[model samples]
Each structure stands twice: as C-alpha cells, then as structure tokens.
Target: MEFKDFPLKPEILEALHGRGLTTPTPIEAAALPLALEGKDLIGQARTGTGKTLAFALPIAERLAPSQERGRKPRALVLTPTRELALQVASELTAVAPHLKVVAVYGGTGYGKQKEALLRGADAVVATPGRALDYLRQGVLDLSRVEVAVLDEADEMLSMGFEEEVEALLSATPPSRQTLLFSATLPSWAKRLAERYMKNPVLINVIK
Candidate 1:
C-alpha cells in the first residue's frame, strides 16, 4: 500500500515523499496502521524489513508539538546497540524532519549526548544502560513520554538488559503507548508485554 494511504501526519508523509519512499513493506503495511492509531503493538520481522520506520513513523506523528523546542522528550525508542540507536535516531531525524531527535549512548560521546539532552529533543533513541545513566542523574525525564518503543527487544533481553529496560519503562507513565519490534518474540518478552501493555496488537509477518 502507499505510504499516503496510512493516514500519517503530513510531516511524515512528506518526509517519505522527500526520501522517494512511496510504499510500505509487508510489515509496515500490517503494523503501521495500528501504530498510527496510538495503539500499543508488537511487530516481529527479520532484518532489512523496514522495521525502523514502522515504529518511528508513529512516534514522530503522534508527538505533541512543543513551544520549547524538543525539551522534555515525548517519545523514546530504545535499541540494543549504540550503533543501532544512532541509526534509529537518524531515521527519526529523516522521517520527522522538523522534530529534534537525539541519540544517547555510552563511549566518549557521553558529554556531547548530555549537551544534546540539555538542549532538548522531541524524541530519543538510546541503549538501555546509557539511557539510564541520564535518567538516574535526572538529566532526562521519561515521565512525560507519550510513546515508548523497544526496538530489537529480544536482542536487548539476550544482552541481559531486562531490568534496565524495565526500569526505563517504569519511568514513563503507565498510560503511554508501548511498541515492541523484534526479529523473534521470546517468552520473556511476551511476559514483559503482558505486564506492561494493554491489549497490544501483535503483527507478525514473514516474507
């Protein structure tokens, strides 16, 4: 189906247009519609399946515009690796266009990441441990987050960040929409989903 057929916000649709991306992949077709409705979702698909945009578009579109720039980020997308976090951040930057997105992760870039958070962001993509580093210092607040996405959830759990992801989710209000995307959904993730999400739609597809 066409990207425009999904009822996404104008900014997102235009961003898709600008990037010459007119179509949704199979997973995108099944999952994006529900995600765009502000519904919690779990999308299971393999790599190179356009999973990033499947979740990113919803976060970008649903984010409430702020008068204070991107201060007090309203959206969070947690990835397993710093590199993947940066990739997700870049996707958000491209698709959202106007919204400020920051990628926070460990390594020497800590100070620069801190400064970006201080300046503010509409959305954040980060690894679990690095995200908590700021959350613990109160440098960042997940309390206002409207959408919480756990990208590559199974991979993160395998990396032994279950508690960290738990802690991060706890920081956000319970009412926030939760989105999970993984190549495979293990029992642990299912149990995690059962506890945190409210009747979340599961969109698993194979191509």
Candidate 2:
C-alpha cells in the first residue's frame, strides 16, 4: 500500500522513485485504485504478481503528451511472447519516462519496426502476430488508442493468439481503457472478457 497511496501523477511518482519502486505489489495494490479510475480491469495475478506495474501505472497515468508531436498510438499493450514484448517495452520505458515507448515483435527487420511506427508512440508494446502485421500495414494506429492492455490473457490464448486477440480488440477505440492482465482465466479467456470488456474490475491477486 504505497506508490504514495495511489492517485499517481507527479511523473508517476517520479517514475516510481526512479525505479526503486516504493512498494505496491499486491497486484499493485488491487490494480492501482481501479486502474486510476478509468476502470475496466481484470488482473488475476500469479506470475511474479507485479502484473507489469498493474497495467503500467494506468498506462502512464492515462497518457497525454501528443499534441500532434508524435503521430497516433496512445497506449495498446498486448503481450504473450517476444520476451513479453521486450519485457513490456522495458517496463513501459522504466515507468513512462515521458512516454514514447514501443516494442512490436516478430523476428524483427521491418526497417526498425517501420521507424518505430512512423516515429510516434505513447506506448504500444505488442506481440500479437507482430501487432497484426502492423495492423494490416497501415503501420499501427488504433485511432488514438487511450488504454487497451491485455498482457498475457491466458498466455495470449495459449499461444494460439485467439484470432489475433480478437483482431487487436476490434482495433481499439470503443472509448478505450480495457486492461485484462491474466495468469489463468481460461474458457477462451472468459469468452474474451465477455466480448471486449465494459463492466470489468475483477482484481484477484492470490500470490
């Protein structure tokens, strides 16, 4: 119960005290105050239990910094391989050091992942089949995403990728903020979170 008792921001508590992380690990104290109030969470918890800073601190405090400075992409994070999408894009660039964190996947070489998705990103740590082949070549842009995570949903549907994670959650934007972090919820990942979550908020965190 720390991370300064949630309500994070001050650069996410100075990037979690410069990465020393001042506690908060029981699924980041029950999913960081309902995922920083944007809600829509699931997070069962098991492997290590950090659950990637409980959805990377509400996706770096519900992202901002993009006044057309860096193209699209707000925060999508589907991971189930490529070393957990390069360890969740290096723990979301060490707890969101001024956003702009990318990872993608596959065996590489799409000219530096298409110039890090055309030189723009607020997050975007991916792996669901090379992020659906750069979202069918449009070069990954879930129409200003806003939160969407999925992180290990039953190991990305047992590695089969359950229809590429429901086509990258039907290509983002249903007023975003999805979450999901799993360690076991099977049954087709609870029917893919009852078809693209809405009234979510489950938490769990057993140890």
Candidate 3:
C-alpha cells in the first residue's frame, strides 16, 4: 500500500517525499500504523530497517505544541550512546521539519544541554545516564511528555544503564505510551518490558 493511503498529515507526506522516503521499509510498514493508533509497541528489527523513523514519526505527530513556549519538552527518546542520540535527533529533525528537537548526552558541555532544555524542545533524544543526571538536577522535566521511546533498549542494558533507565521510566506515569525497539529480545529485556510497559503490541521482525 502507498504511504499516501495512511492517515498521516499532508505536510508529513510532503516531507517524506522531500526526504527521499517514497517507500516504507518492512518495519515502518507495520509499526507506523500501530504507533499512530497510540498503542504501546515493541519493535524487534535490525538497525537499518528505518525503525527510528517508525517511532519518531508517530511521536513527532503526537507531540502537543508548546503553548506558552520557553522550551517545555513534550517527547523523550532515550538512546544507548551519545553518538546514537545525535544521530537519532538528526534523523528526527529531518522527518519532523516543523518540530523543535534536541540531542542530550554526556561528553557535551552542560551549557548546551541545559540551554536546549530551557528552550523547550518539542522532542529531546538522550542517552539514559545523562538523561537521568539531567532529571536528577531538575534541569529536565518529563511530566508533560506525550510519548516515551526507548531506542536500542537492549544496548542500554548491555552498557549498564539498566538501573538508570528504570529510574527514568518510573518518573513518568505508568500509562505513558512506551515503545521499546531492540535487535534481540533477551531474557532481561523481556523482564524490563514486563515490568514497565503496558500491554504492548510486540512486532518481531526476523531476518
């Protein structure tokens, strides 16, 4: 089916064409529709399957615009590494053209991350540990978040950010839409899903 047949906004369709995305990958074909329906999802797909956009597009579309403005973040995307956070933010910026986005991770100056948060980015993509640190310092707020995406969820655990990720999610309401994407679902990751996510629609992609 054509992407134009989906219920996405006209501007998003135009943006997709402008970005050279005229076709949907396997994961995107399945996950995008489910995500747009506001269902919590667990997508098991490879790195290059366009999984990032599969989730990012829905989150960007779902985010509430900053009404009073000054920089209240409406969406949080947790990545496994600083580089990945930046990469995700870049891709998301391309897809959401009209939205404001920020990438926050360690090894960056505190001033920059702080400034992004203070500016009320519509979406903030971050690494687990650094995101937790910002949350602890009260520099970032996730209360108004409409969507929470855990990109590379297993990698975060392998890198030992499991505890911090847990704490971070605990701060959000239990009912928040949680989308966890991983290349493989190990036992620990499964437990993490069981503990945190609501009745999620698991989309496993086997290559």
Candidate 4:
C-alpha cells in the first residue's frame, strides 16, 4: 500500500515523497492505520524492515508544531543504543521537518543535550539511561508527552534497561499512546506490555 493511503498530514506525505518512499513496507502497511488512530500497539518486525518509519510517521502526524521557547516534548521515542537513538531522530526529523526533534544519549556532554532540550522539541528520540538521567535532573519533562514509543523493546530489555524504561513510563501521563516494537518477544517484554499498555493492537511483519 502507498503511504498516501494513510491519514497523514500533507507535510509528512511530502516528506515521504521527497525521500522516494511512495509505498509502505509490510510493517508500515499493517501498523500505520492503528498508530494513526492513537492506539497502543505492539509491533514485531525484523530489523531493517522500515520499523523506524512505522513509528516515526505516526509520531510526526500526531505532534503539533512546537511553539514554546522552552523544552516541551509532545512525543518521546526510546531506543536501545545511542546509534539507534540518533537513527530514529534523523528519520523523525526528515519526516517532520516543521517540528523540532532532538536525540539525547549518553557519552555526550550534557551541555549540548541540555541546550537541545531547552530549545523545545516536538519529539525526542533517546536512550533510556540518558533519558532517565535528564528526567531525574528535572531537565526533561514527560508530563506533556502525548505519545511514547519503545523502539527495539527486546533490545532494551537485553541491555538491562527494564527498570529505567519503567521509570520513564511512570513519569509520563497515563493517557499517552504507547507503542512498542521488537524483533522478538521475551517474557519481560510481554510483562512490560501487560503492565503499561492498554489493550494494544498487535502487528506482526514476518516477510
């Protein structure tokens, strides 16, 4: 199916066209509709199956343009590693060029990350550890978050970020839409979904 078939904003459609992404991959085809409807979802797809856009496009469509001069992120995407965080942020920025998006992870000085957060982003793509650090310091606020995505949930669990992810989820408003994507479903991942998500739709992309 074409990305144009989804109920996305004009900006997102244009962005996808600009990137030569005319058709939706298997995962996108199955997940975009539910995601656009603000449904909590658990998606399972192999790596490089366009998982980034599966989550990013819906996030871009749901987020309003940022107006506040201070940091108030409307959407948050948690990844397992710094590289993955940056990758997700890059994809989000491309699709939602009008909205400010930032990536925050460890191994970088807090100065730059803090500045990016203070500048006000519509979306934040981050790793759990660094995100928790900023959250503890009161620099990153989750109260305004309307959508929260746990990209690579199994990877995060394997890396021992279950507690941190739970803490981050706890900080967000309970009404937010939650999306979790993983290559594999471990017991911990299932428990996490049961504990935090609300009747989430499940999508599996096997081919």
Best by TM-score: 4
Cα displacement (angstroms), candidate 4, residue 115, comes to 0.8
lDDT of 1 by residue, 1-207 (tens): 898888887878889899888988788888887888889988888854388778878877787667584478899999988888888888888998778898988866578888888888889899999999899989888978889999888889889999999999989999999998878889988987998897988888845
The C-alpha RMSD in Å for every predicted model, in order, reads: 1.4, 13.4, 1.4, 1.1
**Cα-based TM-score, every candidate:** 0.95, 0.34, 0.94, 0.96
User: 1-207, model 3: which lDDT tens digit per residue?
Assistant: 566767887888888888888777777788888899888889998754378777877976786455456666777899999999999999888878778898999986799888878776888899988889889998888887778889988788789998988888888777678889989988877887899888888888868
Q: Model 3: what TM-score?
A: 0.94
Q: Write the per-residue lDDT of candidate 4 for residues 1-207, one digit (tens) a residue.
A: 788877888878999999888987788888888888889999999854478787888888887775889958989999999998888888889998888998999977899999989878788899999999999998899999999999988889889999999999999998999999988888988998998899988898766
Best-matching candidate per lDDT: 4
Residue 55, candidate 4: Cα error in Å is 1.4
Model 2 alpha-carbon miss at residue 143, Å: 17
Ranking by TM-score: 4, 1, 3, 2
By lDDT, the better pick of 1 and 4 is 4
What tens-digit string does per-residue lDDT give for candidate 2 at 77-125?
8888898788879988898787788898987677787787888777888
Better of 2 and 4 by TM-score: 4
The segments of candidate 4 whose C-alpha lies over 4 angstroms from its true place after superposition are none
Q: Sort the candidates on lDDT, descending order.
A: 4, 1, 3, 2
C-alpha lDDT (0 to 100) for residue 53 of candidate 1: 78
Listed per model in order, the count of residue pairs whose N, CA or C atoms clash below 3 Å is 0, 0, 3, 0
